[PDB]
Design a protein around this ligand. Structure first.
Ligand SMILES: Nc1[nH]c(=O)nc2c1ncn2[C@H]1C[C@H](O)[C@@H](COP(=O)(O)OP(=O)(O)OP(=O)(O)O)O1
Ligand code: NA
Ligand code: NA
Ligand code: NA
Length: 156
């Protein structure tokens, strides 16, 4: 198999809205995503998720709930991205725009799927139904899925 690198992804999901961040600069600018990044040496995955949420958005949370895991493979990249997906409904501060990321709330009947990673159209709906999931997606570039698997699970 390939080697994998650990990443986190955090969805701030409230009863009627979700907070996403727009990538502001460079290639892939204009895409909305949850918050997250690479797990660092020595921290648990959940603590890495909390850290990235705070570094990227300004928000803190006491805890997160793990809701899924998704492996991404990109043609021409030998390393897989192993993305651990968390939610929370409970926040206590305001999101902050940076030079790299603009946060915005979306109502849950206005989820901006066409401007999100294409895989989100498949797994986001499960997250909204309080389901847990495991997924895998192989991409050619940023837009085209060549192969994928997705399964609801009882335990992540
Ligand atoms: N296909 C996809 N679908 C999705 O919903 N999120 C994806 C995705 N592919 C990547 N991501 C998320 C995972 C993770 O939160 C982020 C990628 O991590 P980054 O490159 O942002 O890591 P870092 O912030 O550690 O890197 P730097 O800021 O460049 O140091 O994008
Ligand atoms: Na980051
Ligand atoms: Na990082
Ligand atoms: Na990031």
């Amino acid at each position: 198999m390939k080697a994998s690198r650990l990443y986190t992804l955090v969805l701030v999901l409230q009863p009627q809205r979700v907070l996403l961040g727009m990538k502001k600069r460079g290639f892939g600018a204009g895409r909305w995503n949850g918050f997250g990044g690479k797990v660092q040496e020595g921290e648990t995955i959940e603590d890495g998720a909390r850290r990235e949420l705070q570094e990227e958005s300004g928000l803190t949370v006491d805890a997160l709930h793990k809701v899924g895991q998704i492996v991404f493979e990109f043609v021409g990249e030998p390393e897989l991205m192993d993305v651990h997906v968390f939610c929370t409904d409970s926040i206590q501060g305001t999101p902050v725009e940076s030079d790299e990321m603009r946060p915005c709330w979306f109502q849950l009947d206005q989820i901006p799927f066409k401007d999100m990673w294409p895989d989100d159209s498949y797994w986001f709906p499960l997250l909204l139904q309080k389901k847990k999931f495991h997924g895998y997606f192989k991409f050619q570039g940023q837009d085209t899925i060549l192969d994928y698997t997705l399964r609801e699970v009882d335990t992540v």
